[PDB]
Amino acid sequence: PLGVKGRSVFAGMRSFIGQRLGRLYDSFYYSQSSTKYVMVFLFPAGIFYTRFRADTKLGYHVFINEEKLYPDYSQNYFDTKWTNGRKVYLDDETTVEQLKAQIYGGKAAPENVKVACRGRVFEDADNVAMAVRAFCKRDPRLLLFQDNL
Amino acid sequence: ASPMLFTDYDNTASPKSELIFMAGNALGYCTERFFENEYGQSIFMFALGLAYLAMLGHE
Amino acid sequence: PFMWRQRAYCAPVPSAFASQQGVRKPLLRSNSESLSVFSQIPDGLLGHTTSVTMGNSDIFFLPKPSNLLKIALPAFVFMPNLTIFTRAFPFYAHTSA
Amino acid sequence: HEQPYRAFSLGFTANNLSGNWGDYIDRQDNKNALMRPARMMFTDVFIPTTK
Amino acid sequence: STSPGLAFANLTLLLDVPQLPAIWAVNAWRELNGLFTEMKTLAGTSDLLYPSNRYNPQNEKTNRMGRPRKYNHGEWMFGNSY
Amino acid sequence: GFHFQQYIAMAGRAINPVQWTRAWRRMEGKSATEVYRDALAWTNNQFAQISRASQYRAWWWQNPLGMGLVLYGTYKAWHMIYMVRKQKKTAQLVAAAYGQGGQWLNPVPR
Amino acid sequence: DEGINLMKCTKNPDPSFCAKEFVAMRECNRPQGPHLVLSSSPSSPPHYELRPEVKHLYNVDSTDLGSAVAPVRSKEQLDRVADSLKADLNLPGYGHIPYKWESLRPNPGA
Amino acid sequence: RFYFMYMARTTFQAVRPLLAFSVFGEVMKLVLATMSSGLFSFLFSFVLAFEVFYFFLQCYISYTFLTMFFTVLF
Amino acid sequence: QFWEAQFANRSFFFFGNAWTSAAAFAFFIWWSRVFDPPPKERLDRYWLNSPKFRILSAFHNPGKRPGLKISLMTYEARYCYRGLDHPFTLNEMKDFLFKLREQYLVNKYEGIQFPFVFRQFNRVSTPGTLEVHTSPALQQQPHFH
Amino acid sequence: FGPTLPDHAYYGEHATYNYFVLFIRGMRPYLEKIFGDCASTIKNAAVAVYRPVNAFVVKHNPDLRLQFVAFASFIATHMAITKEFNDMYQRLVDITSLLELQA
Amino acid sequence: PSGAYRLPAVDYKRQLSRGTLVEGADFYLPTAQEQQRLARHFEPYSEQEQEERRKFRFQSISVYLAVALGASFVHDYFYQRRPVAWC
Amino acid sequence: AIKGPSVPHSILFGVGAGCCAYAGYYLYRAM
Amino acid sequence: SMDHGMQYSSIYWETSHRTYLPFWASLTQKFSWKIMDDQIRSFLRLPKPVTTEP
Amino acid sequence: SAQARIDPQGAATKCVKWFNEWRQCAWDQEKMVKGYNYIEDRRARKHKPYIGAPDLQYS
Amino acid sequence: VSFSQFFDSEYFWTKANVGPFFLFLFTSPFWY
Numbered sequence A: 001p002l003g004v005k006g007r008s009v010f011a012g013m014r015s016f017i018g019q020r021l022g023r024l025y026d027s028f029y030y031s032q033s034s035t036k037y038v039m040v041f042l043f044p045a046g047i048f049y050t051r052f053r054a055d056t057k058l059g060y061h062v063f064i065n066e067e068k069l070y071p072d073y074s075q076n077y078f079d080t081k082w083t084n085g086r087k088v089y090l091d092d093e094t095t096v097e098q099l100k101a102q103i104y105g106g107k108a109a110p111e112n113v114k115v116a117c118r119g120r121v122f123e124d125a126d127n128v129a130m131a132v133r134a135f136c137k138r139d140p141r142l143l144l145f146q147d148n149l
Numbered sequence B: 001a002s003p004m005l006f007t008d009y010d011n012t013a014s015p016k017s018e019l020i021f022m023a024g025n026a027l028g029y030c031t032e033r034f035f036e037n038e039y040g041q042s043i044f045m046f047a048l049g050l051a052y053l054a055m056l057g058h059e
Numbered sequence C: 001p002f003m004w005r006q007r008a009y010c011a012p013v014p015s016a017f018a019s020q021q022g023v024r025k026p027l028l029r030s031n032s033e034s035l036s037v038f039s040q041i042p043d044g045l046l047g048h049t050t051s052v053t054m055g056n057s058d059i060f061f062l063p064k065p066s067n068l069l070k071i072a073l074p075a076f077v078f079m080p081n082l083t084i085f086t087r088a089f090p091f092y093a094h095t096s097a
Numbered sequence D: 001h002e003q004p005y006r007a008f009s010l011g012f013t014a015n016n017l018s019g020n021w022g023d024y025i026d027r028q029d030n031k032n033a034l035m036r037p038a039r040m041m042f043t044d045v046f047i048p049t050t051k
Numbered sequence E: 001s002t003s004p005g006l007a008f009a010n011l012t013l014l015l016d017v018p019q020l021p022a023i024w025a026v027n028a029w030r031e032l033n034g035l036f037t038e039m040k041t042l043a044g045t046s047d048l049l050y051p052s053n054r055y056n057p058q059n060e061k062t063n064r065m066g067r068p069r070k071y072n073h074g075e076w077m078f079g080n081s082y
Numbered sequence F: 001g002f003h004f005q006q007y008i009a010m011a012g013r014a015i016n017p018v019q020w021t022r023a024w025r026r027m028e029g030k031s032a033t034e035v036y037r038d039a040l041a042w043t044n045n046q047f048a049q050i051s052r053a054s055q056y057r058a059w060w061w062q063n064p065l066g067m068g069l070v071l072y073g074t075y076k077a078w079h080m081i082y083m084v085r086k087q088k089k090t091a092q093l094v095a096a097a098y099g100q101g102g103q104w105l106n107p108v109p110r
Numbered sequence G: 001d002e003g004i005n006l007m008k009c010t011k012n013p014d015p016s017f018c019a020k021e022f023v024a025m026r027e028c029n030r031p032q033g034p035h036l037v038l039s040s041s042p043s044s045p046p047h048y049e050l051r052p053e054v055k056h057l058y059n060v061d062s063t064d065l066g067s068a069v070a071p072v073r074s075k076e077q078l079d080r081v082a083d084s085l086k087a088d089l090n091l092p093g094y095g096h097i098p099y100k101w102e103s104l105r106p107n108p109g110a
Numbered sequence H: 001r002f003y004f005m006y007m008a009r010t011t012f013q014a015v016r017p018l019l020a021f022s023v024f025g026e027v028m029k030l031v032l033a034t035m036s037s038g039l040f041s042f043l044f045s046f047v048l049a050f051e052v053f054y055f056f057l058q059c060y061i062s063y064t065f066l067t068m069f070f071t072v073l074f
Numbered sequence I: 001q002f003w004e005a006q007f008a009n010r011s012f013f014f015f016g017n018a019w020t021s022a023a024a025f026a027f028f029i030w031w032s033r034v035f036d037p038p039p040k041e042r043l044d045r046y047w048l049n050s051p052k053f054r055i056l057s058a059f060h061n062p063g064k065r066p067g068l069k070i071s072l073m074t075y076e077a078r079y080c081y082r083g084l085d086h087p088f089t090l091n092e093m094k095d096f097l098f099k100l101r102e103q104y105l106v107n108k109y110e111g112i113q114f115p116f117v118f119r120q121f122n123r124v125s126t127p128g129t130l131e132v133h134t135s136p137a138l139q140q141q142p143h144f145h
Numbered sequence J: 001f002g003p004t005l006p007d008h009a010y011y012g013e014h015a016t017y018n019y020f021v022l023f024i025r026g027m028r029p030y031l032e033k034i035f036g037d038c039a040s041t042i043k044n045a046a047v048a049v050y051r052p053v054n055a056f057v058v059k060h061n062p063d064l065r066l067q068f069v070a071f072a073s074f075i076a077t078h079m080a081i082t083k084e085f086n087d088m089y090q091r092l093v094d095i096t097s098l099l100e101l102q103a
Numbered sequence K: 001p002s003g004a005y006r007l008p009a010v011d012y013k014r015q016l017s018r019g020t021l022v023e024g025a026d027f028y029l030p031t032a033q034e035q036q037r038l039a040r041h042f043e044p045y046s047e048q049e050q051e052e053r054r055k056f057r058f059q060s061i062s063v064y065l066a067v068a069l070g071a072s073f074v075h076d077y078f079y080q081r082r083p084v085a086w087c
Numbered sequence L: 001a002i003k004g005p006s007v008p009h010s011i012l013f014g015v016g017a018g019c020c021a022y023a024g025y026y027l028y029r030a031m
Numbered sequence M: 001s002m003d004h005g006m007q008y009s010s011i012y013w014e015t016s017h018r019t020y021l022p023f024w025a026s027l028t029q030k031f032s033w034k035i036m037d038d039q040i041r042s043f044l045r046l047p048k049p050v051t052t053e054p
Numbered sequence N: 001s002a003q004a005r006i007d008p009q010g011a012a013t014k015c016v017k018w019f020n021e022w023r024q025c026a027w028d029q030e031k032m033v034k035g036y037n038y039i040e041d042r043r044a045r046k047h048k049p050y051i052g053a054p055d056l057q058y059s
Numbered sequence O: 001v002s003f004s005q006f007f008d009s010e011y012f013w014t015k016a017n018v019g020p021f022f023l024f025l026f027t028s029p030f031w032y
Ligand SMILES: CCCCCCCCCCCCCCCCCC(=O)OC[C@H](COP(=O)([O-])OCC(O)COP(=O)([O-])OC[C@@H](COC(=O)CCCCCCCCCCCCCCCCC)OC(=O)CCCCCCCCCCCCCCCCC)OC(=O)CCCCCCCCCCCCCCCCC
Pocket: F002, F003, F004, F005, F006, F008, F060, F061, F070, F072, F073, F074, F076, F077, F080
């Protein structure tokens, strides 16, 4: 005897979802504290953040010409030293000045510092996204150098 | 200095969080290289042949 | 624009030094136009050449005589069974039976 | 991710990894020096030169 | 259950089925951004918007590549210069 | 396997244009289902003759590998007659269009 | 008149996208007068024409710069153009086929 | 790390027969291309037959390891 | 049989070692995208340098040489569907011009063949009395010592 | 402080009478209804399309030889029209090749 | 938790101690008509069922051929089209 | 040849089938 | 001494290299939708390209 | 560096690559100064080869 | 037939033809 009169398939769907959620709560309660919180919240959350950031934002590999132009990262923790090739995720509205400040930690940068991509110098009042689209399409490797000349 | 004296462009590190894309990048590489072309058609025929042999053995 | 006798790629063609030839063709042309594909040739049918498609040709047919056979044959497992021990799968997947 | 891939062929009968044919301009012999004199033996059909 | 021969599938599953929520979230975010872009276009714009493009910085004082517009200091009889 | 000579003779009759008129006349008042069933029945009769007569009878070609050698020879004949011929034509085609080995050339370097 | 016509057209545009209006306005707004105009005709197709007093500024043999509408697709015009190009090139080797796939069909494939 | 170990073992056991059929085949092909006389050819025929038997041995070994690596209780 | 196998144990869609599991795995990979053809943005990654593609182009263009049209298809796939304003490097430009030159020579000289253009065919035209001589020795160039 | 967890929190379910197999065995009737209805819909549509076409064909080509003639004529007409279109595109391509030669 | 949504099973060790565990029948027979076949001995199958079964004494190579040709045609000329050059 | 069951009638039938196929192609591309 | 040259290199097919051509390939022929698309655009008065304007 | 005063053809063979890059940069600058862009098409159905692969966003 | 009496469980699972409904449901992505 499939189905009952006066009852709707949508009501049955609600019933089923309630059953599933109650069972999930029971199984989460009767589980190890050591494993369940990690496996249910921290790995999903990290994976979500990473995948969303990669699939949505757009990033750039940043290099610097000379060691004298490297930033001072001695004080901030988990990164005591600059390394070239760092992947850096930015927003579409970011400019070269904002990028430079982000690199140098809101501190006094050196003089006549400029950004290039495939040999092509960027203006500082330029959107990084459009500048890359123009000069280095699908090769976002940026380089920071000193333009004395 | 000038930007062309720089050569070490291929040291493109990437965050350690992105190691979860290991299998995804592998499958994407094998898709672009093997599966979406004639060798992939051969592989599909091989899978169908596995099904054929399983059915034959059952009967 | 600095080393004219040493940069021949950026120089005019020899038909330009000759002083003799509705609309006419241009008199001055560079050798740097050799670095472009569609400089002289037209761009006709540029974006329509990857649209000429041809179908594949493989036929998936093979007769299956089982009357010839009387023994079973081995078969691969393609994926792990997640319908059983689903909750423990990340915890036992690394072991070998 | 912008460089192109070389074709892949691998089977029990034939492959495309025991040799290199080269580019369209810079070509080269797929077979190595010891079996170049016996190229006829690695062919199902052979149409020799005119001389 | 499992076996050494299923290491490929085990790794792929463990690493990819957790990503499916994020993939669906990305798809939903894309649809919402498209909806908002189309609503803006219906409302009206000075310069056009490219729908399937990443970023649209164009305005009265800005080009379609983020630079300032040339010859935009004065006013023109035919209206906008674009 | 059996009746290879009869099969050659059948092909010869099929390629004869007089037999095309004969078949045109025989096709009067006839259905595709009937034709297909007739052909299937013929093939079944051949394979059934094999399955029955192999139990008690041995052909002139009998060998310690049995009919496996005859079937291998059928395959090899088909291969050398059809597939290697097609390979020859494809070889000449590729050699005229790109040069010998043109289909295995590497992509243009970027 | 040119400005008004352009403004009216661009809001209810033509499949030409108002190109003739645009060029008319551009040539009217010149100080000394229009260099390029659209010839008035009883003939069906209109032509672009160049004034004589500015002919020395343009690289032209005559004032007629051709029709103001593109050609219509025609097998005959294509044949004519191809024959003319072949004659001008004068290349012995065109149409030569050193190898053709062996087939009853004249053109295998195409 | 266990997944990587297992896939390495599996792929080696899968390609073992391909190797025995292909690379030793290439070696035999070199020897065939180089040899001309009859005595050496007579002696080399037995090497070819040995390669046949060796290929079947490798195939048996791979069958064993693959039925071990693709056997599931449940 | 397939339907009943689905409700049998260890025989669900692609799980297990049964022929139903194999068939479902085949359908699953078919339903997936991995075996679909690539897009136009991604054709010059593998397909335009493929033996199947090259043989089919040569076959369906009987007496012609499609290297140049293949170069132009690569240019298209990179310019019009991937967004590259500069699709060709110096190498690819040289290859394009090489193929253009070969086309010119093939149409200029009737019957030209390998040493001058990459092309080989068997049915050739010979004079009738073909003389065979030794090449001259390579020209002695002057050298120090 | 003792056991906080029961046994079923750890131990694996029954090997042969498990949760999924019982579930799918319970859902078998609804799935049968669903897929039978879908298959019947598709079959009825295909039959409604195929019956009148077979009737119209057999009415005008009742015999096998006539069916073969009609099939061959269909093939020839298709090939001829394709050849017309191909000839046009070939003329365009020929012009482009001639301009390449001119370059 | 209340206990309404508890686990709908008991562990195999406790069943074994209760004397309740059954191990068998990886497969099942849904309908009683199908269950009682080997016990009836006189009508394992009804007559209608018998004549319906007589239609499947052999597999249909004709249907195999037709379905395979249709699927190959569709898969080749709708799903596996690829571009080709034109000269 | 116009109405009756005959070889010309079958040829006409095949021609009509070809033209209807191409009409269907026209509709497909139009939509 | 360039035209009508002799065969300088050999032509061959290596063992078991594939051909990717079936037996009806000679009857196969190409097709482009471009001519039909042009006719349909002209008949339905769809957006024209600017290449129609000189 | 290649001594084009005495070997101009040999040096041009080395330097035309940088001439080509300059030629490209010229257009990239003109198109940034004069805003030139194009209507990009919607995303392809198989932009990603594999579902688990990351679709790295490019400007 | 009404929406309510169609989506009633008994009529939905016994007398109704749910083929078109479930086919539309499967092909939803195509329509979207
Ligand atoms: C060239 C060979 C290599 C081929 C190419 C390479 C391919 C390699 C792959 C090999 C795979 C083989 C295919 C196996 C499938 C099974 C085939 C099979 O067993 O049945 C075959 C088939 C017999 O079918 P059947 O069902 O057994 O019916 C038997 C009859 O009832 C009759 O009853 P019967 O009792 O009276 O006789 C039974 C049988 C008895 O057959 C035998 O026992 C063998 C005969 C003598 C013993 C030694 C045999 C080897 C050396 C002598 C024969 C040389 C020819 C090689 C024949 C290969 C088979 C052994 O008789 C024959 O079948 C005659 C076969 C010999 C034909 C001789 C033709 C002479 C012209 C050729 C010039 C001379 C040779 C040049 C050098 C070639 C060197 C390679 O034989 C036929 O070909 C039918 C002939 C019909 C007449 C056709 C018109 C005359 C044309 C003659 C040529 C026939 C085609 C073959 C070409 C060979 C000559 C170039």
